[PDB]
Ligand binder design. Sequence first.
Ligand SMILES: *Cc1c(O)ccc2ccccc12
Ligand SMILES: [Cl-]
Ligand SMILES: [Cl-]
Ligand code: NA
Lengths: 243, 96, 200, 265
Amino acid sequence: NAGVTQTPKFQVLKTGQSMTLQCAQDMNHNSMYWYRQDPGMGLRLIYYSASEGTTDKGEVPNGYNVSRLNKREFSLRLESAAPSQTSVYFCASSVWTGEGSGELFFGEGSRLTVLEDLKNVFPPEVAVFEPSEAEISHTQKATLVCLATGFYPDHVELSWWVNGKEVHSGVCTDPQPLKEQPALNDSRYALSSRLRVSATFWQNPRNHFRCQVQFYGLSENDEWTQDRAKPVTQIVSAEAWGR
Amino acid sequence: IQRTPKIQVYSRHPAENGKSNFLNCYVSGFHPSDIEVDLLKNGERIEKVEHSDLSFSKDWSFYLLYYTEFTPTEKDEYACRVNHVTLSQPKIVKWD
Amino acid sequence: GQNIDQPTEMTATEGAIVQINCTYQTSGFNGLFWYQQHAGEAPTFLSYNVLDGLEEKGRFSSFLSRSKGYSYLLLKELQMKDSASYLCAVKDSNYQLIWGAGTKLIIKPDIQNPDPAVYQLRDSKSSDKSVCLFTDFDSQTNVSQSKDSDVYITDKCVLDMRSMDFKSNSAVAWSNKSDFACANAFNNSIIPEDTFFPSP
Amino acid sequence: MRTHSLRYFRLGVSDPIHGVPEFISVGYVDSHPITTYDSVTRQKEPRAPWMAENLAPDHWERYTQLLRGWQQMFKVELKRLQRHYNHSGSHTYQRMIGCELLEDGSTTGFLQYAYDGQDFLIFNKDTLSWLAVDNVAHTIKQAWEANQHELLYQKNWLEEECIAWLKRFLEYGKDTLQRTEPPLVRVNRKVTALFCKAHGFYPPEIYMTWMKNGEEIVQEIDYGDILPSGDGTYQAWASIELDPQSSNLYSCHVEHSGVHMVLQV
Ligand SMILES: *Cc1c(O)ccc2ccccc12
Ligand SMILES: [Cl-]
Ligand SMILES: [Cl-]
Ligand code: NA
């Protein structure tokens, strides 16, 4: 009942590194596909599997390979990662191939960034800014702002937590990060989010607010040689209390 | 419903003694598809015999053409022998 | 299997109607699909057309003319949740999918009581940044990027306070420069004449 | 141009004897095989040289993958039918799809299935429905008809795609398919019957009949099959029995490719 499950959601790779993406579907479908999605163009088929026991190239097979491991699973292999393979990868399935009007069912996607060097990988700095009293007095509302800045690559999930529970109502997070230096190709990124609540809610001294950013970065096996701390996968947060 | 094969034996060209020709056995209208076909010269099986791939008719039955190169003589009698699940023993159909 | 075209982006207002066009030149034709894809999410199937005409599903309709090689996806009574990319795809003679590059649909919220203002948020103990919030402006207002390299300005974001059935636009600006003042943060933007600037 | 047709057949067998394919698929333009696939080779291959010469390897590679999928789907469908019929042993499932382009420019299109060699389901692309011959077919009809889109897809494929393929292949095979070899026709005598015999002709479509005193006698005429001679041409015959008690003017009439001939006996 999960539909199409693909992993990992994010991955950083060094040029030349190997990577396998996993995909499973529990819909008892026969046909499976791997796509890449890049800015400014349509989805491009990498490899596909019309049925269990057969696979073939799509439009852009070079630098990849696949295994239709069984009816449920279709893995994508990057044997030697290249920066051009920086992309968002989508697994999909359909009941059959070349039979009628059947649609595709898509996985959640996998964001890959491939770098020559991992020395430009940085976690976000996270800071929370308490609402303006002028806003409170003028509108009877109170907007908190969270800033996550200086991170690279763009592999983050920001969330707000109010009194220990994640919230979505009253939240707006930029859909796209800001390049802190638009001209540089590997510019670090900034991301802002707002949480707006009633002045009454802000003014309860026992309400607690937290901005949390999950960063997906390096793991144990990734080599690190820089003077600064190794930018591993991590959660960085900042908080505020009502006043 | 199983359908017994129709069996027709004929030469490619109007036969004339001493002139090279092809002997055909056209087996058609049968169902299901498994079938066995031999061409016979004087009652004995001919070794160099060719056939088309299994073919499909609109009425869902099947057909095949079996043939061999030969030179008809006055004395030699030719036949086509066919076996199929609808036949309790092989059916032999003589040329002419 | 050769070419699909759809506009890169479209912007319409909440409550209104938008027609998203898709033209195709393909080797043969076995149907045209539309998919919705929210930012950061999977595409999901919306519609299929293969004969000529208009097909309706809820607030969405999809039209096809095979002879003109043309389809549109029609969205009525637009809501904020309709903000998404819409992908056109055609199956060619060999049942291969040809994908359009997608149309990004941006929805302008209908702001009932605009109250544009630029507020100064409180400094954080743990940060050298000053932070300014441009908020509650009408949707016709555009926020432009900073032209000072040490000032950062995000684009406008629509938030929804569901419990108050209240939506509002805002953009954030920040810097750690001694200069920086909220009074000047957005002056590279065209902002409303009556924008409220509370005193320092 | 005279009438031409494109037809694609599938055969599935549920418990095939040793070595015999469980699945075979063959296409035809008129009487000519053009493509083949089966579960043993697992490869799509041309069956006419003018198909091989005009379709690049990526065509064959792609239809190889498509047919491997269609093979599995056919197996699943047959398994479902044989279960619902509560049938043991080996049974067959067939499909035929295709279209005709008539001389006058009009078109036809058809899609139908068979179980054990008998009509099972027949598509009507004008009413967008399936005709079911029995209750097993009726269950399948209900399932297939539940998705209107699938019916629309087949109508489009039969009316637009099929005709476009046909025209494409007609041009590829022009020198074969659009040629004419007129028949050589003779009358033999052999209760004595008159035999009218034709051979050497292409296309295979030919009309042969006997007239008596200028009137047709269809009930008393025996018609032979149109048979392949093995060299790309065809042969056929028709016979009647002579009245030993009264003379009559008999004549053999042959029509082939827009030309009529009469052999007065
Ligand atoms: C098998 C095959 C090939 O090769 C060409 C065109 C087709 C059209 C319909 C079905 C099968 C086909
Ligand atoms: Cl087929
Ligand atoms: Cl075509
Ligand atoms: Na490859």
